[PDB]
C-alpha cells in the first residue's frame, strides 16, 4: 500500500536538469495515460453522437478518430526507442530525437491545445453543476421567450471567470496537493464506467421505469407538469391538469377553444429505457440531421396531420448537425496520448515500457467507446437520446439513467473527474511553455522563464490563465471542443510527417529500433490527420498551417545565427554541413561512376596562367554540372608571399568565369612544387565531396636539355595519382584545342580501346558530344584484339552493346600481335581478377553486367621489359596503325600504359609516349583508377 | 506591305538549335499577346455574367481576374531581363532563369491548359454552329420533354469529334497555310469588337427595335409565335393566335378552359435594347442569382398572383449560379499572356520589347472587357440579359443585337475568331510537348519526340488529339472553363512563387534588372492565384498541389542520377554544392565572430593520437553545432605509406565518435611535418566553409636538450597561423584537462585581459559555461589598465557593458607600470588604427559600437626588446600578480603576445611563455587574428 505517488502529472523542468547532474508498466504509464484519456465526451455528450446519426455512423465516427491516434502512437513509439530516452516528459524526448524546430510548432501547438482543453472541462463543469445540481442558482434566467440559450450562455461566463480565478489560486499555492490527489481522481472515472455496464446488462431483466410524456409523434418535456392523462382526477372533480393549461388557455374549459393538434392526437407514456431485451436497437440504426428548431418526434407513434402551433413544451433541436460537426465534438475524447511519456524520468526500463504502456492504453478507451456506442443505441429510447439536458426524463443524465445504483453516481462521479481534468490542463500547460522558454529557441519568449525557488512558472501561469479565459467567454462546450480538436490534429500531423521524412531521406541519427513500425504507417497515418482536419473548417486549417510553417522558418533562422554569427549566410552554411555529414555512411563504391575533375595549372613567373586552355576543355567535359576543384602552386616561403597568394587567386577566379566554369579555387604556396601538387591531390575537398580525376597538360618541352626536373616532375604526379586510385586525363598539345565559340562543323573522334578501360573510354566521348562545340561529331571507336581471340564474335557483340544504350557510333576490330601491344598486355591478369574481386562487392544482376563494355569485351580467350632475349617496350608498329586510321580525326582518346615497377625506366616511359602520339593534332590519354563501372550512360 | 509574316504561332523547338549553330514591339509582342486573349467568352457569355450578378458584381468579378494575370506579367517581365533571352519560345526563357524542376510543373501545367483550351473552343465553335446559324441539322432532337439540355449534350459529342478529326488534319498537313492566315484571324476580332462600340453608341439616337413577348411579370420564348397578343385579327374574324393554344386546350374556345395565370396579367410587349438614353442601368446593378428551373422575371411589370402551372413556353433559369461559379467561367478571357514571348527569336531587342508589350497588352484587353459591362447593363433589358441562346429574341446573339449593321457581323464574325483561336492551340501544345520531351528531363516522355524532315511532332500531335477528345466527350462549356482555369492559375502561381522565392534567399545568378519589379509584387500576386483555386473546387487544387509537386521532385531525383551517378545520394551532393556557391557573393567581414575550429593532432609512432584529450576539449567547446576540422600529418613517403594513410584516418574516426565530436578527417602524409602542417593550415574547406581558429597542444619537453626540432615547429606554426590572419588556441598542460563524464562541482574560469582581444576572451568562457562540464563555474574577469587611465571609470564602464549583455560576470581591474607589459604594449598604434582602418568597413551605429568589448575598454589616455638602455622583455613581475589570485581557479584565460619580428630572438619568447604560466594548472592562450568583432553574445 506504499505506492501511493501515482503522480499521473507531467515531468516538465526542474526534474530535466537534475538528471543531468523507479516505476514500472502499469503505475508508470499504462494508468496516466488511462486518466487523461476519458473526459467528459464520454458522460455529458456521447449519448448525443448516438442519438443523432444512428449506431451505423456513430461507429464510424469513433473508428476513424481511435485509428488517427493509434497510428500516432506507433510514431511516438518509434521516437523512444531510438534515442536514450531523456527526462524532462514529451517536450524533452521530442526535440531530441527529432532535433530542433520540430519541438517548437510541436510544443507550441501542445501548449495552444491544452490551454483550451483547460477551457473546455471547465465549461463541462459549470454545465454539471448549472444543471443536474442545482438549476435554482442562475443569474441570468430571463422571462421565457423565444431567446433562452442567450441567457444559458451568460450563465456560465459570469460562473466560469469566477471557476478559473479559484482554479489558478490552487496551483500557485497547492501544487504538492493536486499531485498527491490523482489517484482520488482516478477512482471517480473508474467506478463511473463500471456503473454504466452494471446497469446495462441489468436492463435485460429489470428496466429502471423512467417515463416520458408523448403527444402522438411529438416529445413533451417532462418538467412543469405532474401527471401524463390531461384529466387530472382528484377525486370525481375532473378539474384539468397542468398539461391542458399550456396548450389550452386556461382551466374549467372543457368546452372547447384548445388547439388544433391538441384535440387530435392523445397523449400517452411510453418507456425511456426498454432495456437490452427489447430489440430497440432496430430504431436506432439510422441517422436523424435535422435543422435547428424542429420538434424530436419518434417512428412507430400516431399523427392526425392536421398542422398546429409551436408551443414552449416541446423539446427542440438545439443545433443544427451534420456529419462533419460530430467529428469535431467527439475527438477530444482520443486526445491525451501523450502522457505515457510524461512519467519519462522514473521508468526503469524507458524504453521497453513506453511502446508497450501507450499502444494498450488505445486498445483500452478505444473499447470502452466502441462498446458504449452499441449498448446506447441498444437500451435507451431514440427520443431521449436525441436531445442534451435531459428535458424529456425530468432533468437527468441521459447516461445517469442507464446507471445501476442512481443516477447520482455519474453526476457526482463526473464532477470530480471533470475538475480533476482540469486541473492537471491547468498545471501541464504552463510547465510546458516554461520549457519552450529555455533552450533559447525563441528569443521573445525568454521572460516566461520565471521559476520560483524548486519549479512552479509564474509568468507562464498568467498567459495560461488568460488564454484559457478567452474560451470562457466563448460559452456552449460544442463550440470550443472543434477549436482544440485542429490543435491536437496540428500536432499530431509534425510529428507523423517529421518520423517519416526522417526514416525515407537517411538522417543520421535516426535508427528507430522498435518491431512493428515502417515508414508507410506513419505516412497512412499523416494522410488521416489532414483528412479530419479540412473537414473541420478548411478556413481554419490554411492558416494553421502556415503560421505553424512561419514559426518553422523562425526557429531555424534564429538557430543559425547564434551558430553561424549572423543570419541569411549562416542558412548556407548549416545546409551544406547538414548534406555533407548525410554523405557519411552510405555503401560507398557506387556503380554509376562519373568524372568529378581536379584541374592542375601551371604558373609561371610573374603569377600567370601558363596554359589557359586547360580550363577551357575542363568546361566542354562537365557543361557547368558537377563538382570541379581547380588547383595551383606558388613556389616559394609562405610568410613572405601571402600577399602575392590573394592576388593569384583573383585572376583565377576571373578566368575561371570567362570560361564558364562553376566550381572553386584552391591555391597553396610550397616549399617545392613535387610536394605542393602531392598534397593537393589526397587533401581536396571536404569528405565525400572530393575529385575522382586528375586533370593536368602535358609537359612540353621536355626533350629540351639539361632540366631532369621538367619531366620528372610528371612522372612524379602520374605516380601519386596511380597510388590514391583517381583517374588520370593527360592532354597533348592544349594549346591546339578549341574554344568555346568556335563550334567544329564535321568531324570524328576516335577512340582506340586497348584491352583495358573500356566504360571510361565511352562514357568521355558521350559526355562531350552534348555541348555546343562538339555537337556534329561523330564517334567511331577501335578495339584492340589479339589473335586467339575471335574478332568475329567481338564486333558482333559490341555493336550490339551499343543498340541498347543509344549510343550511336561505329565499332572496328583490329588485331595485333603480342609483340606489340606488350606494354599493355604485360600486367593484365595481375590486376584483372583483382578488379573481379571487386567486381562483385555490391548486386548486379545481369541486365546490368551486360552494360559495362568491358565485361561485354571480355568473352574471349620473349621477356619484353622496361629497361634495358630481353627486348624493349617499343611503339613504332602501334603508332603507325592508329596514325594511318586517326589522322584529321580532330580528337584521339587512347589509354596509356602504366608507369614501370621501379625506376631507371622514367626515361624511357616518357620516349614511349612520345612516339605513341606522334604525328597527331588533339591526343587525350586515358588512365583508368581500378575502380569505375559505369551502367548508365546518362 | 511586304509586313505579312505576322505569324502569332508559338517558337518551340527546331529554332532554338538553330539558334546555337527581325521584328518590333507591335508586329512582334504586341499584336501576338492581344490576338490570343480575346476569344469566345467576350461574344457568347460576357453578357450571361453581366445579367446575374448585376453590373456592381460583374465589375468585381473582371477587376480581380485582370489584375491577377497582370501581377504575373512583371513576374513574366522580370524573366525576359535576367538572362540574355533565348530563342525558343517561352518554355525556354523561364526554364534558363529559373533553371531545370520549374520548366516541368510549369511547361507541364501549360501543356495541359492549352490541351483542354482547344477543346473550349472547338465546344465553343459547334454552339454558334448548332444555334444561331442552322437550327436544322442536328440529329438527336429529341421530342418536347422535360429533359431536352440531355438531348443538346448529344449533339455536341458527335459534331464535336468529327470538328477536332478535321483540325487535326489541318496541322498535320497544313501548318504552313494556318500560319499564313494569321492576319486573317486577327481582322475578325477587331471588326467585331468595334462593331459593339458602334451601335453602343448609336442606341441613343436610334435603338434597334427588338421586341420580347411577356405575359406579365413572366418573360416568354419568342420563338414559335407570330403576333404579341393573344388575339390575331385577319379581317373581322377573331381565330385566337398560336399564344392562345400553347396555354389553352385549341383554337375556337373563347368561352373557358384556360389556365389560372392566363386569363389575368395581360400580353404585352416591352423593348429588348431601349438604348444608352434611357437610364436602365439603375434596374441591372444588383444581383439575380436563381436555381435552376425558375422563371425568367423583371420587376417594374405588373402579375396578379394567382398561381398557374409550368408550360413549355417559358424561359428557364439553365443552371444554379453563384459568385464563385462565375470567376471560373470568365477566367478563361484573361489567360494568354505567355504569347508576348513565343515570338522571342526574332526581335530586334528581345529585353526592352517583351515588359512593354506584354504590360501594354493587358491594359487594352482589360479595358474592352470592362468599358463592356458598363456598356451591356446600361443598354439591353435586363431579361434579355438574364438567358444564353437567345430565346427571347427570336433566336440571336444578344451581343449581336447590340451591334450596328447587322446581328451577322458577330455570328459569321465569332466563328472564325473561334477557330482560329482553336487551330492555334492545336499546334502549339504538340510543339511544348516535344520540347519537354527534349532536355531528358523526364526519362517516360522519350518517345514523344519525333519530329518529322521539318519540325511538326507526330506522336505528341496523338496525345493532344486524345487529352483534348475527352474534353469533347465531356460538353456544355459551362464545365470545361472551369478546368482549364485550374491548370492555367497553377503555372502563373508556379511562376509567382519562384520568382519572388530567388530574389528573397539571393539565388546566384538572378538579377532581374527591370524598373517597377519588387518581390512583394510577385508575393501579392501570388496570393491571389491561391485565392482563385481554392474558391473555386478545393478538391481540385489540393490534389493539383502535389501532382505539381511530385512531378516537382522526380526531375529533381532524375536530374540528380545523370550528374551524380545514382540517385539518392546524388540529392545529397547536389544540396551540399548549391549552398556553397551561394556563399561565394555575399560581403565578407561579418560582423558577429563564432569559432570554427582547426584542431591539429599529432600522431607519433605505431600512428596513436597523442593527445587524444584535445578533442575532448574541442567538443566541449563548440557543444556539437558548427564546424570542426581535424587535421594531421604522417611523416614519409606517400607512394609506400598509401596504405597507413587509410588505417590512421579509422583510428582518428573512431575516437572522433567517443569523444562526440562532429565532423570531418583531413590526414595528410609530407616529407617534413613543418610542410605538411604549414598546408594544412592554407588548404583545408571548400571555401565558405573553411575554418576560422587553430587549436594546437603545447609542446610538452622542449626544454628537454639537443632537439631544436620540437620548438621550432611551434614558433612555425604560429608564425604561419597569424600571417594567414587566424585566431590561434593553445593549451597548456592538456593531459589535466576534464573529460566528458566528469562535471566540476564548484570552481572558476579567470580571464587575464591584457590590452588586446578583448572580444574574443568573453565570448570563450560563454560558450564554455553552457556545456555540462562548466556549468557550475562563475567568470572572473581581470583587466590591465596603466596608470595615465582612469581605473575608477573603466570599472564602471565594463560593469555596465555585462550588464545588457546578461553575463553574469565580475570584472575588477589592476594597474601595473609600462616596464612589465612591455611585451603587449610596444606594438599597439601601429596595429590599433590599423584595427580602427578597418572597424568601419560596413555599416554600425552606437547601440552595436557600445556591445563590442574592445570599444567600450577603450575610452582611455626604456627600449624593451626581444633579443640581447637595452632590456629584455620579462615576466615575472606579471606572472606573480596571476598566480597570486588565479590559483585554483581550474581554467585560466590569457592573451598570449605575438612572435618577434625576426629570429634570434625565438628561444626567448619559449622562455617568456615558460616562465607566465608558472604555477597554473590549465591554462588555454589566446590569439586574436586582428579582425574579430562580437556584438551578439549567443
Ligand atoms: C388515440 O387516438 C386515436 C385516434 O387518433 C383514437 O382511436 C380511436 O379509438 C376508437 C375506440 O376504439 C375507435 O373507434 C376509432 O376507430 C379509433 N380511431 C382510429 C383512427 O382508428 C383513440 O381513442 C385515442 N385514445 C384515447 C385513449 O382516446
Ligand atoms: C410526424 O407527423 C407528421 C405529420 O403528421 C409526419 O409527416 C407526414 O409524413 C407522411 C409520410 O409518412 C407524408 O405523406 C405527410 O405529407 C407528412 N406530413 C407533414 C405535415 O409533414 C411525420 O412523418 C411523422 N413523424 C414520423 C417520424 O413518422
Ligand atoms: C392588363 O391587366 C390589368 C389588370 O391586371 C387591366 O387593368 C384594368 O384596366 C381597367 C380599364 O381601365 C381598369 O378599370 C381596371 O381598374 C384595371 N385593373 C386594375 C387592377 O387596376 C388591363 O385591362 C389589362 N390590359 C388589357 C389591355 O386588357
Ligand atoms: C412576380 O410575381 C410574383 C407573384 O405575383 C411576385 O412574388 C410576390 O412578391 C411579393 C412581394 O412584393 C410577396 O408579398 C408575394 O408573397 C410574392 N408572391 C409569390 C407567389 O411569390 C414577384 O415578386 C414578382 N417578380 C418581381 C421581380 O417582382
Ligand atoms: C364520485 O366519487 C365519490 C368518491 O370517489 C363517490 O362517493 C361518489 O359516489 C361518486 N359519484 C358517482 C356518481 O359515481
Ligand atoms: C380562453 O377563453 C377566453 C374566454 O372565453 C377566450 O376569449 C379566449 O379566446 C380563449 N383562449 C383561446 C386561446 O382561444
Ligand atoms: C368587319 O370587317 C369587314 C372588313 O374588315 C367589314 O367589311 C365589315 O363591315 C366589318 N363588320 C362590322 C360589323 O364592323
Ligand atoms: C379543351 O376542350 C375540351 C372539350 O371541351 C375539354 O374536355 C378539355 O378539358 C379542354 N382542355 C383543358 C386543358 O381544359
Ligand atoms: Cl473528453
Ligand atoms: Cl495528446
Ligand atoms: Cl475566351
Ligand atoms: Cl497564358
Given at each position: 500500500n506504499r505506492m501511493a505517488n501515482y503522480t499521473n502529472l507531467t515531468q516538465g523542468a526542474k526534474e530535466h536538469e537534475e538528471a543531468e547532474n523507479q516505476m514500472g508498466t502499469f503505475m508508470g504509464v499504462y494508468l496516466?495515460?488511462?486518466?487523461?484519456?476519458?473526459?467528459?465526451?464520454?458522460?455529458?455528450?456521447?449519448?448525443?453522437?448516438?442519438?443523432?446519426?444512428?449506431?451505423?455512423?456513430?461507429?464510424?465516427?469513433?473508428?476513424?478518430?481511435?485509428?488517427?491516434?493509434?497510428?500516432?502512437?506507433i510514431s511516438m513509439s518509434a521516437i523512444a526507442t531510438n534515442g536514450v530516452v531523456p527526462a524532462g516528459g514529451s517536450y524533452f524526448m521530442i526535440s531530441r530525437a527529432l532535433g530542433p524546430e520540430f519541438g517548437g510548432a510541436v510544443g507550441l501547438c501542445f501548449y495552444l491545445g491544452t490551454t483550451f482543453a483547460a477551457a473546455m472541462y471547465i465549461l463541462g463543469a459549470i454545465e454539471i453543476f448549472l444543471v443536474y445540481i442545482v438549476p435554482r442558482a442562475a443569474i441570468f434566467h430571463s422571462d421565457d421567450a423565444l431567446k433562452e440559450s442567450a441567457a444559458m450562455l451568460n450563465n456560465m461566463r459570469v460562473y466560469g471567470t469566477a471557476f478559473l480565478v479559484l482554479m489558478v489560486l490552487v496551483v500557485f499555492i497547492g501544487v504538492r496537493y493536486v499531485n498527491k490527489f490523482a489517484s482520488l481522481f482516478l477512482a471517480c472515472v473508474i467506478v463511473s464506467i463500471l456503473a454504466i455496464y452494471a446497469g446495462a446488462i441489468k436492463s435485460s431483466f429489470a428496466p429502471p421505469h423512467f417515463p416520458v410524456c408523448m403527444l402522438g409523434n411529438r416529445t413533451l418535456s417532462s418538467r412543469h407538469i405532474d401527471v401524463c392523462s390531461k384529466t387530472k382526477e382528484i377525486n370525481n372533480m375532473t378539474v384539468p391538469s397542468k398539461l391542458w393549461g399550456f396548450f389550452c388557455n386556461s382551466s374549467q374549459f372543457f368546452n372547447a377553444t384548445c388547439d388544433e393538434y391538441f384535440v387530435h392526437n392523445n397523449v400517452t407514456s411510453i418507456q425511456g429505457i426498454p432495456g437490452l431485451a427489447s430489440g430497440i436497437i432496430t430504431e436506432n440504426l439510422w441517422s436523424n440531421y435535422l435543422p435547428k428548431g424542429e420538434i424530436i418526434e419518434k417512428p412507430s407513434a400516431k399523427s392526425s396531420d392536421v398542422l398546429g402551433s409551436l408551443n414552449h413544451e416541446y423539446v427542440l433541436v438545439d443545433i443544427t448537425t451534420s456529419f462533419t460537426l460530430l467529428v469535431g465534438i467527439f475527438f477530444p475524447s482520443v486526445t491525451g496520448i501523450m502522457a505515457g511519456s510524461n512519467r519519462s524520468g522514473d521508468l526503469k526500463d524507458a524504453q521497453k515500457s513506453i511502446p508497450i504502456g501507450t499502444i494498450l492504453a488505445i486498445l483500452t478507451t478505444s473499447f470502452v467507446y466502441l462498446s458504449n456506442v452499441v449498448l446506447f443505441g441498444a437500451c435507451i429510447e431514440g427520443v431521449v437520446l436525441r436531445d442534451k439536458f435531459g428535458d424529456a426524463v425530468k432533468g437527468n443524465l441521459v447516461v445517469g439513467t442507464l446507471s445501476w445504483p442512481s443516477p447520482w453516481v455519474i453526476v457526482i462521479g463526473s464532477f470530480f473527474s471533470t475538475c480533476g481534468a482540469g486541473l492537471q490542463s491547468l498545471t501541464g500547460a504552463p510547465r510546458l511553455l516554461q520549457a519552450i522558454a529555455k533552450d533559447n529557441i525563441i528569443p521573445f519568449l525568454r521572460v516566461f522563464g520565471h521559476s520560483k525557488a524548486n519549479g512552479e512558472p509564474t509568468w507562464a501561469l498568467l498567459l495560461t490563465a488568460a488564454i484559457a479565459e478567452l474560451g470562457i467567454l466563448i460559452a456552449s462546450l460544442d463550440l470550443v471542443a472543434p477549436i482544440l480538436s485542429m490543435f491536437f490534429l496540428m500536432c499530431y500531423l509534425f510529428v507523423n510527417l517529421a518520423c517519416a521524412l526522417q526514416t525515407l531521406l537517411r538522417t543520421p541519427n535516426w535508427r528507430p529500433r522498435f518491431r512493428y513500425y515502417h515508414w508507410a504507417l506513419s505516412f497512412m497515418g499523416m494522410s488521416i490527420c489532414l483528412a479530419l482536419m479540412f473537414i473541420s473548417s478548411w478556413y481554419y486549417a490554411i492558416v494553421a498551417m502556415v503560421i505553424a510553417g512561419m514559426i518553422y522558418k523562425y526557429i531555424e533562422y534564429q538557430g543559425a545565427e547564434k551558430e553561424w554569427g549572423d543570419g541569411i549566410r549562416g542558412l548556407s552554411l548549416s545546409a551544406a554541413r547538414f548534406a555533407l555529414l548525410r554523405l557519411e555512411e552510405g555503401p560507398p563504391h557506387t556503380k554509376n561512376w562519373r568524372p568529378q575533375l581536379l584541374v592542375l595549372l601551371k604558373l609561371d613567373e610573374d603569377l600567370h596562367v601558363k596554359h589557359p586552355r586547360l580550363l577551357t576543355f575542363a568546361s566542354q567535359l562537365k557543361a557547368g554540372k558537377g563538382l570541379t576543384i581547380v588547383g595551383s602552386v606558388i613556389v616559394g616561403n609562405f610568410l613572405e608571399n601571402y600577399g602575392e597568394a590573394l592576388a593569384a587567386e583573383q585572376t583565377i577566379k576571373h578566368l575561371m568565369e570567362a570560361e564558364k566554369v562553376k566550381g572553386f579555387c584552391q591555391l597553396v604556396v610550397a616549399a617545392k612544387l613535387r610536394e605542393g601538387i602531392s598534397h593537393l591531390i589526397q587533401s581536396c575537398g571536404l569528405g565525400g565531396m572530393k575529385h575522382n580525376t586528375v586533370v593536368m597538360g602535358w609537359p612540353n618541352g621536355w626533350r629540351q636539355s639539361e632540366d631532369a626536373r621538367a619531366w620528372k616532375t610528371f612522372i612524379g604526379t602520374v605516380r601519386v595519382t596511380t597510388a590514391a586510385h583517381l583517374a588520370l586525363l593527360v592532354a597533348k598539345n592544349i594549346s591546339f584545342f578549341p574554344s568555346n565559340v568556335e563550334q567544329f562543323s564535321e568531324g570524328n573522334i576516335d577512340v582506340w580501346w586497348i584491352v583495358h578501360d573500356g566504360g571510361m573510354l565511352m562514357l568521355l566521348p558521350f559526355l562531350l558530344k552534348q555541348h555546343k562545340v562538339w555537337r556534329k561529331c561523330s564517334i567511331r571507336i577501335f578495339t584492340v584484339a589479339q589473335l586467339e581471340?575471335?574478332?568475329?564474335?567481338?564486333?558482333?557483340?559490341?555493336?550490339?552493346?551499343?543498340?541498347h544504350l543509344r549510343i550511336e557510333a561505329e565499332v572496328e576490330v583490329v588485331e595485333m600481335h603480342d609483340?606489340?601491344?606488350?606494354?599493355?598486355?604485360?600486367?593484365?591478369?595481375?590486376?584483372?581478377?583483382?578488379?573481379?574481386?571487386?567486381?562483385?562487392?555490391?548486386?548486379?544482376?545481369?541486365?546490368?553486367?551486360?552494360r559495362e563494355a568491358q565485361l561485354v569485351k571480355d568473352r574471349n580467350s620473349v621477356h619484353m621489359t622496361w629497361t634495358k632475349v630481353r627486348r624493349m617496350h617499343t611503339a613504332v608498329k602501334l603508332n603507325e596503325v592508329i596514325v594511318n586510321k586517326s589522322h584529321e580525326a580532330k580528337l584521339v582518346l587512347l589509354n596509356m600504359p602504366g608507369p614501370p615497377r621501379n625506376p631507371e625506366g622514367d626515361?624511357?616511359?616518357?620516349?614511349?609516349?612520345?612516339?605513341?602520339?606522334?604525328?597527331?593534332?588533339?591526343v587525350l590519354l586515358v588512365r583508368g583508377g581500378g575502380s569505375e563501372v559505369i551502367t548508365i550512360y546518362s
Open positions: 496516466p495515460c488511462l486518466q487523461n484519456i476519458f473526459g467528459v465526451i464520454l458522460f455529458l455528450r456521447l449519448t448525443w453522437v448516438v442519438g443523432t446519426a444512428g449506431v451505423l455512423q456513430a461507429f464510424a465516427i469513433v473508428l476513424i478518430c481511435c485509428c488517427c491516434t493509434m497510428l500516432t502512437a581471340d575471335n574478332s568475329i564474335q567481338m564486333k558482333k557483340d559490341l555493336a550490339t552493346f551499343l543498340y609483340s606489340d601491344i606488350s606494354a599493355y598486355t604485360y600486367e593484365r591478369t595481375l590486376m584483372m581478377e583483382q578488379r573481379s574481386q571487386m567486381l562483385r562487392h555490391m548486386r548486379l544482376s545481369k541486365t546490368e553486367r551486360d626515361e624511357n616511359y616518357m620516349e614511349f609516349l612520345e612516339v605513341l602520339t606522334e604525328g597527331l593534332e588533339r
